[model samples]
Target chain A: MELRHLRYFVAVVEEQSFTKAADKLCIAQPPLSRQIQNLEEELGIQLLERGSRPVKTTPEGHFFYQYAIKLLSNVDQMVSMTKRIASVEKTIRIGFVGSLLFGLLPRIIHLYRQAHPNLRIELYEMGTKAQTEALKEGRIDAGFGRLKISDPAIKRTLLRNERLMVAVHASHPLNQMKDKGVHLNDLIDEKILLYPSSPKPNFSTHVMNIFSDHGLEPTKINEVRKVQLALGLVAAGEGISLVPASTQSIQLFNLSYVPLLDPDAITPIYIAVRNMEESTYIYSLYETIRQIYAYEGFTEPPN
Target chain B: MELRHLRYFVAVVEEQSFTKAADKLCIAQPPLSRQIQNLEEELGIQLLERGSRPVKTTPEGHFFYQYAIKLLSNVDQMVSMTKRIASVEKTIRIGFVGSLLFGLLPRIIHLYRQAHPNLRIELYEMGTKAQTEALKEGRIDAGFGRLKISDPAIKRTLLRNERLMVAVHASHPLNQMKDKGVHLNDLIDEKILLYPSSPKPNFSTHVMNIFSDHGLEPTKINEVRKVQLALGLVAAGEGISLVPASTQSIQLFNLSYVPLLDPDAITPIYIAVRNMEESTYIYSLYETIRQIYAYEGFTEPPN
Candidate 1:
């Protein structure tokens, strides 16, 4: 079937009214109705139930609706894929979470550019959830962020898992403590600040899991969206916040980083790829990263 | 800078001849020469050693060449990304190694499509190496195949590890063995066949690694480019070939599959993605696969 027919059918089904569908599709209601009728006649089945207040699809119409959606999507994919292939330039788009902008992501991109010398590297600031969707949608080629994703289609390599540290105001009592570290128990009575409050099962959950594992819960919790926001709040003496060690690179005024005593409290950074095959250029990038990690002697998770 | 200037500059540097670049660009040599001079004047640097024989880029020109390539590539990526975002279609492109067409890949795609009927599914047959490259290039959203990739950018999930099997002619003496299984020791004196002889670190290497582990070697090795070719040679009484157990689903007329007695002789099937975040739709596909594997009671590696 033609893409226009699929588009017309999907619009009709989604809008649930020929008149509304016509308005949405920017066409006349009579033509839209006729088109539906022609489609039913061509398929030799009644695609919609007539005389319903809001038009409803027949049993066959439901099946056809799904097919129509897929067909229209395929047409769009063809056009975009063809355009991409026809374009002559080479580009690599990277997806990263906000915190990585402090150090890791930029350093990796810089090193990658140095090795490749002629490839374009684009960056997208995204959370793990958004990055995953972007990767699936071909909005980004590689995502460098943290999250334990269980999709069989995505490949994740353990880059570096930085030990979790507590960010606190320099004037905070914890700064005067004899030990240079804070235990989960120490934060039990204080407000705990967490980042990326939305998008469930994120760093907030990771921090909460750590608390739960330690048999402790904060007296109060403050949820913020960005690492900078959390650190800023902590610097203002709102609450202590957990952050990756790499975040130490962000030198905010009046902020101090104290090591998290629990060994299990860490954030992992992975380089994710959607392709089954490893390309030479990407491999070169990987090698460059491996060499950097080795040279810097980053802490690696035990296999 | 204009994309055409970058394009002209890159072409001139790559061709190492202003005349050849003009021919390639379908323009006159004088205009092309003038374009390079204009680009150099704009950048306020002598980009080319004009007096040289074939026209060579100076040190500054070499640096600008890299920048020009990156700029042009970024322009192409911007155009493609814009088109993809503007399109009304929802599509997921899957890259797979050729051998998966026998069963596993198709079954997964079928199950995935059934669950998300409205989304378009695109399939690309590519080797692991090519798939990785395509993933980095954003040609495909996900990849399904077998490869042990160490790229930090790609996330790989082990779907299943199939025991390696010997593909032998039904009339071969090994097919008549009482246990109906083959061992490395048993095949030591026989000719062993492998597919994908080129492309270092492929299935051939996997098979060779298995042989190396057992401290036994094939008397003679035959190399072929495809599993079908390898099996065809085996059926023609050329030699026995090593293959994943899933290949038995192909049902070649004269071929018989014999389990490799060694427990360690196995190949893994992985679903690869370019992001650490699992999108909702991809998570649905992962859930479907998990349910199928649980229902089938497939062998799973210990987490």
Candidate 2:
């Protein structure tokens, strides 16, 4: 019925006595006897000869014992192979929004993947909406998307609720503002630019939400599908866009980011997985990212 | 600790419900539930979360579930590998007395190894006394030692009791004798030679027994350690040696082997292995030799 039954039967056959088999198995004689009886009756076969005084097997019983040994040997070999594999490596591809690469996120990712030689980390740049599809289809094992999107099939965990910052050109009047930073209301009259002009419900949509939350609308609404294009426009003093505070690491000529002073001016950095996944490798990524976040002095997760 | 416990726990984790797991395992829910409880208690670890609904695992339980699946998966792999191996092959070296090679013994060994793709055959020439040492030392997997020798560690089987013959020079008076064959008495006055003058108890010793059994002493007892020297001398009419009837295949310049008339003038051909060997390969060889002997119309084996 199970490997234990096989082990018990094989031991009894080898020792030629139930008492010795029970002792070898470190179990009581009663259970050993009962178990062998259970095995014999279940298979409708007589293993121990009733007419014999000592342990002796019928031809069929002897035949069964031979295969039973092979089954047990295979289990031994499997454990050995699995452990050897884990001791070496396998590859896992992860999807993440490009902006997260701007800050300590990249360093943390490098550290997390660097800490374990057995897991190879491959990162792909995709929107949270695309990440949802990727996770569902198994195109990626895990993902980091800046805004939370509800998908019935995705298990999303908020890693950090990072504060947003304003990217201003060198000639902009706001660049000279106090280090205390500018509020959403102060940037109301200036043009606002959003990135990744995707289908709908993207990181750009989240940026638009933050603007509307402050009861403020920019003098001009500009949209670009590429993060670099948006940055190029912002560096030219054409408009300003809000970015996760981590993006402050992406320094460019005549470009600057100021902290958003508004209380709710924040975006979330979430890791996503298929709701059905329960592999330890998934959680290993979770553990690595969490430790790296706390160690790097990141904001507490929102949810 | 066996596969059953690991299988049950992993099934529960994957299904996330004991009811579904029991259905999948074709077992009753109560026993499945009881078995899981036994496992938890035996390890003294709480796997199922007490404070959660719908199936949840404590961190430790979750961790245990990961490795449990690997153990189960390993069993699957090992069986696959074992079956694959049996489908392929390994090599076995066998020892045998040189004289046996003259008969269908060589053909049987060739057929036995040729019948299976997964096992290779290698032959080593050794006397019966030497074969006993080779078998005990694991130098040979199986052996064909023509004379039986007692060794506590060897399991020997008589393959055949082949008739002995007298190798006479063509010009000898015995060559003109009727084909009903030369009796041991007919050669009492002839210079009878014994071969392979080994230390003692060799094939030559067995030949001397047949002469003494007839209560006849030879005109002279010539001793030669080399079989070729005995054959060369017999061909030159200097003396004659008793040889296995199988050696009749060797046609020499003037040597001819005439069958002995003595009813007990047979020498045994035995197959040997270590007493501890119960492998199927051993029996495969036994089956091959038996079938080959009967198919070739060889004399029945002696006890």
Candidate 3:
């Protein structure tokens, strides 16, 4: 039955007279009486004994009155309860390296927001080492970066191995043979620049490991604190630099970015979350990346 | 920042020429050029070096382009993931008795819907016996009834003990003393019709216990299969009957319902859920009822 029916019945029961209940409720007694009649008919039971001096309750009427009054008071509670529950915004904190903004990180976050509009997304910029601790310590729920993090309480998913490229000035002789791309074996003679030099096991170290794996090292190694500085120096013809292929969106006047033909010139991108805890944030992130990787030019996540 | 900027930049990077990228993208050369400039400027880095014979990527441009392409491919994933996550409706099942329809069950459910519109609420009408099994076997999430169901796996909360009432025919001499209501001792002489006779420990048995506890019993006890049948007999001058105070919504032609003045003349209403398992559904239900009870005339859940 409707709450209005209950209100009318409750008023009539409390006043013990339909006319007085109507005056008390500020409604016409005739319609109020009919409303009560309709309420009783719909319930398939009599609710009032009106033939008495004022009014009396039927057996079912007595039961209906007490509950209706309780519910009438609860009428204020329904909306308040609803608002409280609806207003609860679930949140997830994510940690990432500043450099991953050039990869699928921004897009993954964008898509996740579209997936969950009500979920409050909090982002923290930190190295993968810090991300590991944040996840273990329950500070951050998930992390994204290009690093190898091994922890007993952390789980990491390989997003993809992003291919690396070489950035040389436009006037450099290397740009002439750009179509075939340069092999790692040929780059030993050129002055090369690597980024984030002091991070120790960061992108610079990753590039150094690639060179060492190929049994080669650049004769003139120039290390810069950041990729922007490296790119600026490369455009000024100070030295050439290795870069992720995704960096091709940048525009510099005298820089030509070329692919490295070496099969191992790739860096792995990973998404990490709490290993022992149940988390849908990174699970959805990894799944979304897995889907989008197939859709992009990567074919099948670099095999 | 925008998908169009990413799309425009991806075309320029792929074609390696502004003119060709514009022609390949079917956008005007001038706006396309400005959009790419904006994308590069917004990122605070150059993405294309067009002064060359064709075009070349800046170091950052190469990085930006790869991630841009991945994100452009993920635009479709964004919408699809949003749709998938949004369409997932959580569900909860509740079992209740047919008699509770006359009480706060429907109102409580209505209030709950307002709170959780996306939650799928499945309702079933079953006795407390079946409710206990349904709760233990993972069939129903919660239950509501007027019986004392004691099960290790089931946790029950007393919503309130509904005050009992006596329903007499309008022409009966018992209607003469209508002000303070009738007592159990006063009702002992009347031929009382108790309901759901087959259901051994129902409202009928509960009322029988109240009579026995007070050292009084109805001289002639006529049992009926349902409350409606019992109510019908009461109005037809067969006998009087006992009912929960919530039944006052029903209206009969010649029936007078009065309150029971006896102290122990209340029937208990309970909300039952899985005892050992954590559940927010019944937790919310009980919490809401508690709030509403305080608002209504009970003054603190019947002490």
Q: Which candidate is the best by DockQ?
A: 2
Q: Give native contacts recovered, as a fraction, per prediction.
A: 0.00, 0.19, 0.00
User: Per-prediction DockQ, in order?
Assistant: 0.01, 0.09, 0.01
Stretches of candidate 3 above 4 Å error? Answer: A1-88, A297-303, B1-303
TM-score of each: 0.38, 0.42, 0.37
Measured by TM-score, the strongest candidate is 2
- Model 1 interface DockQ: 0.01
Fnat computed for model 2: 0.19
Instruction: Provide i-RMS per model in Å.
Output: 17.0, 8.3, 22.6
Q: Mind giving the per-residue lDDT tens digits that candidate 1 earns over A181-217?
A: 7677887877888888777767888888888888887
Name the better of 1 and 3 by lDDT: 3
